[PDB]
Design an enzyme around this catalytic site. Sequence first.
Site, PDB file in Angstrom:
ATOM      1  N   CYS D 125     -19.025 -26.400  14.476  1.00 32.11           N
ATOM      2  CA  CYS D 125     -20.350 -25.850  14.996  1.00 32.11           C
ATOM      3  C   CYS D 125     -21.270 -26.310  13.891  1.00 32.11           C
ATOM      4  CB  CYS D 125     -20.553 -24.385  15.329  1.00 32.11           C
ATOM      5  SG  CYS D 125     -18.994 -23.456  15.102  1.00 32.11           S
ATOM      6  N   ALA D 157     -18.126 -15.528  17.302  1.00 29.03           N
ATOM      7  CA  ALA D 157     -16.616 -16.008  16.274  1.00 29.03           C
ATOM      8  C   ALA D 157     -15.675 -15.055  16.842  1.00 29.03           C
ATOM      9  CB  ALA D 157     -17.208 -16.040  14.890  1.00 29.03           C
ATOM     10  N   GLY D 158     -14.775 -15.702  17.565  1.00 28.97           N
ATOM     11  CA  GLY D 158     -13.612 -15.129  17.942  1.00 28.97           C
ATOM     12  C   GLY D 158     -12.657 -15.208  16.919  1.00 28.97           C
ATOM     13  N   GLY D 160      -9.916 -17.104  16.606  1.00 30.21           N
ATOM     14  CA  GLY D 160      -9.682 -18.368  16.700  1.00 30.21           C
ATOM     15  C   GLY D 160     -10.439 -18.909  15.177  1.00 30.21           C
ATOM     16  N   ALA D 163      -9.682 -17.241  12.027  1.00 26.65           N
ATOM     17  CA  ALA D 163      -8.321 -17.596  11.125  1.00 26.65           C
ATOM     18  C   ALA D 163      -8.541 -18.768  10.488  1.00 26.65           C
ATOM     19  CB  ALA D 163      -7.397 -17.630  12.205  1.00 26.65           C
ATOM     20  N   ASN D 164      -9.374 -19.723  10.923  1.00 26.36           N
ATOM     21  CA  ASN D 164      -9.769 -20.897  10.264  1.00 26.36           C
ATOM     22  C   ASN D 164     -10.845 -21.218   9.440  1.00 26.36           C
ATOM     23  OD1 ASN D 164      -9.682 -23.114  13.229  1.00 26.36           O
ATOM     24  ND2 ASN D 164     -11.349 -21.569  12.383  1.00 26.36           N
TER      25      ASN D 164
HETATM   26  N1  LIG Z   1     -17.183 -19.501  17.590  1.00 23.58           N
HETATM   27  C1  LIG Z   1     -17.804 -20.912  17.414  1.00 23.58           C
HETATM   28  O1  LIG Z   1     -19.136 -20.945  17.277  1.00 23.58           O
HETATM   29  C2  LIG Z   1     -17.303 -22.040  17.186  1.00 23.58           C
HETATM   30  C3  LIG Z   1     -17.792 -23.309  17.201  1.00 23.58           C
HETATM   31  C4  LIG Z   1     -17.232 -24.409  16.970  1.00 23.58           C
HETATM   32  C5  LIG Z   1     -15.924 -24.679  16.821  1.00 23.58           C
HETATM   33  N2  LIG Z   1     -15.050 -23.055  16.882  1.00 23.58           N
HETATM   34  C6  LIG Z   1     -13.684 -23.394  16.455  1.00 23.58           C
HETATM   35  O2  LIG Z   1     -13.232 -23.344  18.037  1.00 23.58           O
HETATM   36  C7  LIG Z   1     -11.845 -22.559  18.022  1.00 23.58           C
HETATM   37  C8  LIG Z   1     -11.649 -21.275  18.808  1.00 23.58           C
HETATM   38  O3  LIG Z   1     -12.899 -20.329  18.214  1.00 23.58           O
HETATM   39  P1  LIG Z   1     -13.357 -19.293  19.014  1.00 23.58           P
HETATM   40  O4  LIG Z   1     -14.349 -18.490  18.488  1.00 23.58           O
HETATM   41  O5  LIG Z   1     -13.805 -19.643  20.604  1.00 23.58           O
HETATM   42  O6  LIG Z   1     -12.068 -18.175  19.117  1.00 23.58           O
HETATM   43  P2  LIG Z   1     -11.497 -17.578  20.084  1.00 23.58           P
HETATM   44  O7  LIG Z   1     -10.587 -16.314  19.446  1.00 23.58           O
HETATM   45  O8  LIG Z   1     -12.573 -16.630  21.127  1.00 23.58           O
HETATM   46  O9  LIG Z   1     -10.795 -18.394  21.309  1.00 23.58           O
HETATM   47  C9  LIG Z   1      -9.539 -18.789  20.989  1.00 23.58           C
HETATM   48  C10 LIG Z   1      -8.732 -18.937  22.243  1.00 23.58           C
HETATM   49  O10 LIG Z   1      -7.416 -19.653  22.045  1.00 23.58           O
HETATM   50  C11 LIG Z   1      -6.307 -18.653  22.676  1.00 23.58           C
HETATM   51  N3  LIG Z   1      -5.131 -19.245  21.937  1.00 23.58           N
HETATM   52  C12 LIG Z   1      -4.709 -18.910  20.549  1.00 23.58           C
HETATM   53  N4  LIG Z   1      -3.620 -19.774  20.235  1.00 23.58           N
HETATM   54  C13 LIG Z   1      -3.281 -20.433  21.315  1.00 23.58           C
HETATM   55  C14 LIG Z   1      -2.311 -21.420  21.810  1.00 23.58           C
HETATM   56  N5  LIG Z   1      -1.375 -21.625  20.541  1.00 23.58           N
HETATM   57  N6  LIG Z   1      -2.313 -22.033  22.880  1.00 23.58           N
HETATM   58  C15 LIG Z   1      -3.417 -21.739  23.735  1.00 23.58           C
HETATM   59  N7  LIG Z   1      -4.395 -20.711  23.548  1.00 23.58           N
HETATM   60  C16 LIG Z   1      -4.314 -20.167  22.403  1.00 23.58           C
HETATM   61  C17 LIG Z   1      -6.813 -17.391  22.294  1.00 23.58           C
HETATM   62  O11 LIG Z   1      -6.018 -16.272  23.148  1.00 23.58           O
HETATM   63  C18 LIG Z   1      -8.161 -17.467  22.660  1.00 23.58           C
HETATM   64  O12 LIG Z   1      -8.462 -17.431  24.169  1.00 23.58           O
HETATM   65  C19 LIG Z   1     -11.573 -22.294  16.540  1.00 23.58           C
HETATM   66  O13 LIG Z   1     -10.870 -23.345  15.769  1.00 23.58           O
HETATM   67  C20 LIG Z   1     -13.231 -22.489  16.028  1.00 23.58           C
HETATM   68  O14 LIG Z   1     -13.154 -22.539  14.435  1.00 23.58           O
HETATM   69  C21 LIG Z   1     -15.892 -22.179  17.158  1.00 23.58           C
END
Ligand SMILES: NC(=O)c1ccc[n+]([C@@H]2O[C@H](COP(=O)([O-])OP(=O)(O)OC[C@H]3O[C@@H](n4cnc5c(N)ncnc54)[C@H](O)[C@@H]3O)[C@@H](O)[C@H]2O)c1
Lengths: 337, 337, 294, 294
Positions: D125, D157-158, D160, D163-164
């Site tokens: 992001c 920020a969930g 996921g 964790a990274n």
């Molecule tokens: N939150 C942000 O603004 C943002 C912006 C850009 C990128 N990201 C990236 O996007 C990714 C997700 O972020 P988020 O905030 O939506 O997290 P989140 O925790 O809200 O969403 C992760 C989802 O993936 C599911 N999941 C986890 N492991 C899995 C697997 N092995 N197979 C299938 N589903 C699985 C979880 O149950 C959850 O529904 C992260 O890598 C994050 O760094 C986040």
Amino acid sequence: APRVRITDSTLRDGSHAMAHQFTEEQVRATVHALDAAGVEVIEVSHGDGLGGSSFNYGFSAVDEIDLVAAAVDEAVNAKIAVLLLPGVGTVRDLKRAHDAGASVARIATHCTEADVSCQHFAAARELGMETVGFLMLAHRIGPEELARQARIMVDAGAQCVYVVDSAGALVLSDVQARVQALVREIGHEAQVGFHGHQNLSLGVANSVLAYQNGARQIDGALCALGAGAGNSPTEILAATFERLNIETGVNVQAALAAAEEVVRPYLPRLPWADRAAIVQGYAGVYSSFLLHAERAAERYGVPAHEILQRVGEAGYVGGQEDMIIDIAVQLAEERHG
Amino acid sequence: APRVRITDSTLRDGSHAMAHQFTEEQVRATVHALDAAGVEVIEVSHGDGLGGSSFNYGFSAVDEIDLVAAAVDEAVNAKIAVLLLPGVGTVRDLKRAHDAGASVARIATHCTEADVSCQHFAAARELGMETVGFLMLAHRIGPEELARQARIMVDAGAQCVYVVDSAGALVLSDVQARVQALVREIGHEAQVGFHGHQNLSLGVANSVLAYQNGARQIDGALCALGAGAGNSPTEILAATFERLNIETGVNVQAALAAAEEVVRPYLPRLPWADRAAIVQGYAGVYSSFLLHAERAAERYGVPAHEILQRVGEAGYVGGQEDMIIDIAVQLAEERHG
Amino acid sequence: GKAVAAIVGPGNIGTDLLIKLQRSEHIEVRYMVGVDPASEGLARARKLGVEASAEGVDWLLEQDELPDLVFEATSAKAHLANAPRYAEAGITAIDLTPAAVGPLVCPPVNLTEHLDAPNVNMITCGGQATIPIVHAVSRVVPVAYAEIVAAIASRSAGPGTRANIDEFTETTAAAIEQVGGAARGKAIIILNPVEPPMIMRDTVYCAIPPDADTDAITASIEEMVAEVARYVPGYTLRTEPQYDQPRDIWKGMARVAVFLEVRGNGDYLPPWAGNLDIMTAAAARVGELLAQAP
Amino acid sequence: GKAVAAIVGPGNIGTDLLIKLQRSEHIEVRYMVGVDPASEGLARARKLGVEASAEGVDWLLEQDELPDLVFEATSAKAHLANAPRYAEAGITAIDLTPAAVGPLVCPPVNLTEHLDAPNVNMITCGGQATIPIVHAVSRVVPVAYAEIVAAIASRSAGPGTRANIDEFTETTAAAIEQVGGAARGKAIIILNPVEPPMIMRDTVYCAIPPDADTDAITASIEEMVAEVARYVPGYTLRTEPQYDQPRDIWKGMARVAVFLEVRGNGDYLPPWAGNLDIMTAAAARVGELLAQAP
Ligand SMILES: NC(=O)c1ccc[n+]([C@@H]2O[C@H](COP(=O)([O-])OP(=O)(O)OC[C@H]3O[C@@H](n4cnc5c(N)ncnc54)[C@H](O)[C@@H]3O)[C@@H](O)[C@H]2O)c1
Ligand SMILES: NC(=O)c1ccc[n+]([C@@H]2O[C@H](COP(=O)([O-])OP(=O)(O)OC[C@H]3O[C@@H](n4cnc5c(N)ncnc54)[C@H](O)[C@@H]3O)[C@@H](O)[C@H]2O)c1
Ligand SMILES: [Cl-]
Ligand SMILES: [Cl-]
Ligand SMILES: [Cl-]
Ligand SMILES: [Cl-]
Ligand SMILES: [Mg+2]
Ligand SMILES: [Mg+2]
């Protein structure tokens, strides 16, 4: 009466007050004086922890890893600690500090965000380092919420979790309540710490109250050197705990000489609760914003305490120094009319 | 929650830090800023109270009675207080201060010597002044002994008796115990006060604890201006009590501006807990000895903190500045060998 | 042969005086007179064969054989009340309180000046310790201002001292000027309860010309200290007199500071209570001369 | 006509992406794939007629009709495990995690560069918000160093994301260099739980020559902001870019600081969560072009 372990942060929190301009000679002299005084843990990093050197927080004059290495070379009995903030520092940075000889990893998150610390605690434990968790701006949430975040850190590998009064905004019973809650939650398996700032001149008292409610780790800095109005002074913590018959292992006379003869001569100015620092304590603003606010005040021609008051109203967290510039630009326009 | 009355001693205890060199303009500006901030009582005298101008303590640049008169002329809402020490100041001095418009008489004895205060309390009550008793160096005796001395002052006419931490040597529960004992003894008929110094950075916390244990009068000074490491800062007391929801009547922003814009510009140096001031707190040495010790240190070529350590060992009381010179002469010979 | 004396005030000073006067060549202490039957001084008087009464000055003035001399060691206000009663009865009074009804006498300086007066005042302990030093300086150079600081063990200051602290101040200051020869005087008294108890300290500060011969001043001080020590052997110089250069705040004058310690002989209270001796030895000197008048 | 897509990771990013892709001209989202049956994204998929499963990538790869495209929004470690499985099955992968198995794509800068790759990485992001600005500066003057600070509402920020965090840092820094054109890159991410929730902030600092034409740099920045805002209308400049004079600590370089706020359209989380939109709009742009390949 159980002993308390003081960690000195002259060379980490103090880096804020020095604008990260510490030389190797200053670090060596300060580590030598601390170590000789019996100080058991000496923290050495950029103010904002490993990887902190940046436009946002200020660049280091000397690579912090070289300073860590010099600290390790200089220390005879003390452990060298490093601070990391996930989102700023990385596991790669921690590994570099470990290679340089650091043996205590202090991992800091905003008080509501402990779950970002998992990667760093895991890496630190795999390296065999002692771990400490820092819950920053701990006045922002209540005791039980803070204890829940402490549990997250302990489960991740923290061996101690601090209540960190980053804004110097906690007042006495506030510390008692938080330390009590962490002790109830994690005390059977981890230590509780307290790190106080001097923005309301309560750091030392808050530290005594922390210890009396079960904290076994307490932070200070020589001459209060640190962000905002400064940290609880190491030399006063040594004197006060000695008066209270609480063993610290720190020689009071030697600590007073370290502060007076080694640190005081290189102070840019005395850590002070002036109007700007007191506004931080009152409004709950992260202490490291102070010099950045003073720089913006000069850059834009607006008062630093007015910048900090606005920062207070906005609720920014540690690391958000960039917001100071946006606010200063706005204030310059508003004041012009 | 009952309100607390802050007395400001920038212009009395602060006189120590100024070497009694206050000008009329400084007094007028400071009284104006304090009064406008809502401060209810402003103390104006030589550091060692009325009649303090002397070789022993230092001469005033301007007659303290003229400064009292200027303070009274300047004040719109605040009462002007004076300090007297029997054995230094006299009833004749008090009468001069009353004629000049002072309305609060603060009579100070060593904590074990309250019975010398009888002449001055009688004269103050006959004049219709509010009376306050000061028990100096209150760490030197226990709570119950101190309460017995408080009773002597109340019987003599005191309407409030302070626990006075002249050395900045009291630590938290120490204040609680003493305030509790005075409240038990005199509380049904007189107020209890607390006056803290910053030699261990505990003045403000000690003041909060005093209030929470029944004290209704608390001293501060702007920018901590005062003897030793300074007094509890008025502007921090205003901020902290406001955070605690304890009414003081003092506008925090106005108090911060008084400290920053009026007092800070005329500070000879920032009140600081350096090694010499911390030795005072630790060893229990009367705070006003500090600048006299630094003068003797330069005069005789010996360290000020070593003078103060010896003073600590000897057990001198307030007013014994002369002993500093004898000790400095001895130290110069001992160090020569 | 001996003059018949009464001591009024059987406290710290009065009891020390009783002991010292029983060594006297020319004075017989016949009466000890107080107001509290439990006063230790009355018990000491009885043990030493001296008539003792807790019935006050009323009782003293009723006695068939009135004393030739009365020494009063009560408090300033008590002496103010008693002085005219002594005057009426024709009894010469030596006042050890700071009441100062009579002229001020410091024996090392002006012993014979006031021997014809019906009432002489002995100033204070602080005065007797320090006015000889003020005189030792002012006889060499003009002294525009002199200040003395007397610090006494709290255990040696009884209720009578504590009740007249203001008068201590003012009488000592007046004597610094009138007897010590300074143009202006100031006196400070401090009570210290430290244990072990403090030996009396007295500091004397004199404003002196910036071109003063400080060796001459020191020699004069040393000579005077030796003259005082003949009567109070524990009266000593702690250090060389300390000279300081002129300052603007001092109106361009320099300063000498003289540090004294006064050990007593332990007649009543222990030797730390030299404040008693410096006064009572002075009163005894005056008394011995008054005793020899026709 | 439309390419068949799967979304793996029904979280904050995955659910925002689902909504945005249902407006898409060329992509049909056929599968929502998670691991937790309680995931809100799976419930949203079902309401919108999309096949939803909590049986993971195993389930997805068992399906009779495999998707043409997979968008992954799980976490870096999950994508590292899944990427070779997609590659084997012949499914083109768009990675929204910072795993960076594939080359780095920032659509305002290098949209068409990597369209032939079997796996493309969308950075972060923070990257999508700031790399267009780094490029806007570096296309005018050399940038020896560029640093970005991304501050996000904690509620957006969930697990996921949390964790990274390390990978967020390193991948964004790498992209600042390789895509943004700076010689050296640094990235900071801050989570703020303030209420009311914070609209995403991003600051970009670039070291620039001391003699740079700052009016030209500002014009380039403004042009780039307008190009980004065509796809994310809430992407705005907070202030004029701020220029600072050279400092020794800055190796004699000057600085430009650019302050952005990123409001989202409120598709899933409210508009303060512009961090979701800046990523998902970018992934949708890449997806729309990948969808049109033969
Ligand atoms: N939150 C942000 O603004 C943002 C912006 C850009 C990128 N990201 C990236 O996007 C990714 C997700 O972020 P988020 O905030 O939506 O997290 P989140 O925790 O809200 O969403 C992760 C989802 O993936 C599911 N999941 C986890 N492991 C899995 C697997 N092995 N197979 C299938 N589903 C699985 C979880 O149950 C959850 O529904 C992260 O890598 C994050 O760094 C986040
Ligand atoms: N303590 C010193 O070192 C010192 C030195 C020099 C002079 N003085 C002066 O000597 C006087 C006595 O001091 P002290 O310390 O011995 O006090 P004290 O209280 O020990 O003695 C006073 C004595 O006088 C008695 N007394 C009080 N009122 C009386 C009255 N109306 N008639 C008869 N007896 C009466 C008291 O009961 C007591 O025995 C004071 O004026 C003091 O200032 C004291
Ligand atoms: Cl509290
Ligand atoms: Cl305590
Ligand atoms: Cl001397
Ligand atoms: Cl900008
Ligand atoms: Mg800190
Ligand atoms: Mg004081």
